[PDB]
């Protein structure tokens, strides 16, 4: 019927509501036709390509993204999609198919199912960044 999972890259949680439908796939109120830059577009479409466009004619998808920059957001979206489709399959479709899909995803790469755990480390005094200290002249 309807399944809600998230992605996560840096801060940037893309929540993918995957429902029964005709196969549209959207972001907040906009088609995945947009995303934003033409270069990165492939990182969002990739899981779909892996799984096949015919498999998602049963499944509508909406995605709510919040927080983060651009690339991170894209990554989050991708992650959400990956988790989402697979989650749907695990519940309402068969198990074998789900397994197959998972295998395919693994063969392509990590990041689709399992998350990127990295996050901005606290800046420390005596410097501008995390490690980068100021400057001594003696």
């Amino acid at each position: 019927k309807r399944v809600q999972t998230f992605g996560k890259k840096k801060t940037a949680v893309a929540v993918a509501t995957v429902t029964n439908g005709k196969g549209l796939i959207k972001l907040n109120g906009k088609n995945l036709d947009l995303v934003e830059p033409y270069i990165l577009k492939t990182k969002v479409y990739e899981p779909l390509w892996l799984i096949g466009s015919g498999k998602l004619k049963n499944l509508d998808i909406r995605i709510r993204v919040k927080g983060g920059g651009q690339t991170s957001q894209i990554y989050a979206i991708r992650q959400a999609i990956g988790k989402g489709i697979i989650s749907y399959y695990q519940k309402y479709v068969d198990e074998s198919t789900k397994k197959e899909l998972k295998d395919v995803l693994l063969r392509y790469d990590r990041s689709l199912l399992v998350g990127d755990t990295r996050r901005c480390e606290p800046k420390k005094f005596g410097g501008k960044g995390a490690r980068a200290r100021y400057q001594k002249s003696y």
């Binding site: 796939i25 088609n31 479409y45 390509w49």
Partner: protein, 154 residues
């Protein structure tokens, strides 16, 4: 230019399902064709915001701005002048001191809004907050978007 083999169908119904810049351009063109909106007096020798230190260089930038504003209105429920200004902000290089963010020249925006309301596209709502789109205007925008989509398909 934009078109490509995608793995889904696109419900080309509202403007959120259209590519932005192109749409804006189209709207500007339409406006020009109509002669529905003017180009006040000061428009032709003003600077759009503190940070720009230079005139637009687009000739019909006003129209473009208006189009953008329409889109913005459609996107959000109730949107002020301040918000608009914030939206059309850029980096102001203060020469030697590092850059700050720069709030846009709001006057022009306000004028545009006024014009739109006169024409019957935007609506100062007494409930809630500052000026959203008026329903007819919204419908028109949607129609335009649809047209654009059709053109692209063709």
């Amino acid at each position: 230019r934009l078109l490509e083999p995608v793995p889904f169908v696109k419900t080309n119904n509202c403007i959120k399902d259209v590519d932005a810049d192109l749409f804006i351009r189209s709207y500007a063109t339409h406006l020009k064709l109509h002669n529905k909106i003017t180009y006040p007096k000061w428009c032709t020798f003003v600077k759009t915001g503190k940070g720009r230190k230079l005139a637009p260089l687009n000739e019909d930038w006003y129209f473009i701005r208006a189009s953008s504003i329409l889109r913005r209105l459609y996107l959000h429920p109730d949107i002020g002048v301040g918000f608009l200004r914030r939206q059309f902000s850029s980096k102001q290089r203060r020469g030697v001191a590092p850059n700050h963010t720069s709030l846009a020249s709001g006057k022009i925006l306000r004028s545009i809004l006024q014009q739109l309301e006169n024409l019957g596209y935007v609506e100062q709502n007494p409930k809630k907050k500052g000026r959203r789109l008026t329903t007819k205007g919204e419908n028109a925008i949607n129609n335009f978007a649809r047209y654009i989509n059709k053109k692209v398909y063709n």
